[PDB]
């Protein structure tokens, strides 16, 4: 059980270390996502507005 | 040890589950995210490309 435990703890800790990395990947991913959305939003909107106001040329 | 193993095995499962749940939500994140990532910049990028040409009048 000790070996199974060390293996289960290895798996739990492996996975905990890995999930930590994945959680970090999510935090980074969401920040990247926000950057994609925010930049997209900013670009699509800056153009809708730039073209809606800048219509006379 | 049995309880620690059950807890560690339960945690091995929960932590590994969290790992495969996050690997999946991350993939399902990133994959859907790359779609945004590849299309928000390409749409905005091609919009800006087009703008250099849109503005050639």
């Amino acid at each position: 059980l000790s070996d199974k435990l060390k293996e289960a703890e290895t798996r739990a800790e492996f996975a905990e270390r890995s999930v930590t990395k994945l959680e970090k990947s999510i935090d980074d991913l969401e920040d990247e996502l926000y950057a994609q959305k925010l930049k997209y939003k900013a670009i699509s909107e800056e153009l809708d507005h730039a073209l809606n106001d800048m219509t006379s040329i | 040890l049995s309880d620690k193993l059950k807890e560690a095995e339960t945690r091995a499962e929960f932590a590994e589950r969290s790992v495969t749940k996050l690997e999946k939500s991350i993939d399902d994140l990133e994959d859907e995210l790359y779609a945004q990532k590849l299309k928000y910049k390409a749409i905005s990028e091609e919009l800006d490309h087009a703008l250099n040409d849109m503005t050639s009048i």
Binding site: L51, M54, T55 | -
Partner: peptide
């Protein structure tokens, strides 16, 4: 965008036409 293409050309034309009108009218006056 139609607004930019159509007005850039029309405003460009107002300029070109006005420029020619200035030269023409100035020659008359």
């Amino acid at each position: 965008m139609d607004a930019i293409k159509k007005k850039m050309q029309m405003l460009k034309l107002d300029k070109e036409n006005a420029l020619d009108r200035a030269e023409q009218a100035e020659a008359d006056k």
